Design a protein around this ligand. Structure first.
Ligand SMILES: Nc1nc2c(ncn2[C@@H]2O[C@H](CO)[C@@H](O)[C@H]2OP(=O)(O)O)c(=O)[nH]1
Ligand SMILES: [Ca+2]
Length: 104
């Protein structure tokens, strides 16, 4: 079973932690990869009720299992704060426009 179901995609905590660990390293180092400059600040326009505190940063989590290193970011993202705490997994899949919804 999936710990997080992003529409069609299936993720386990292991996928979540591994992807977060890559986004936080880049964040701490002040570097970014890809056209959308990842990772970047997640303003939370949606107004999700995260249990960890801001600021939040979003980073692509991939269905392939590979860690994001450029190219298409897909539709899924892991949101984590300054302390390297996971806020949750979200996705563009099932949401209008460029909005997000949390993963099942
Ligand atoms: N929907 C949404 N987009 C955000 C948020 N914070 C930053 N963004 C960025 O704002 C722009 C319009 O949604 C996009 O560039 C999006 O980045 P991503 O597309 O990389 O998620 C947020 O909280 N919600
Ligand atoms: Ca997996």
């Amino acid at each position: 079973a999936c710990d997080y179901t992003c529409g069609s995609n299936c993720y386990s905590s292991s996928d979540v932690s591994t992807a977060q660990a890559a986004g936080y390293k880049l964040h701490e180092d002040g570097e970014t990869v890809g056209s959308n400059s990842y990772p970047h600040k997640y303003n939370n326009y949606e107004g999700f009720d995260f249990s960890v505190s801001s600021p939040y940063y979003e980073w692509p989590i991939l269905s392939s299992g590979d860690v994001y290193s450029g190219g298409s970011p897909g539709a899924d993202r892991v949101v984590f704060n300054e302390n390297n705490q996971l806020a949750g997994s979200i996705t563009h899949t099932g949401a209008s426009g460029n909005n997000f919804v949390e993963c099942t």
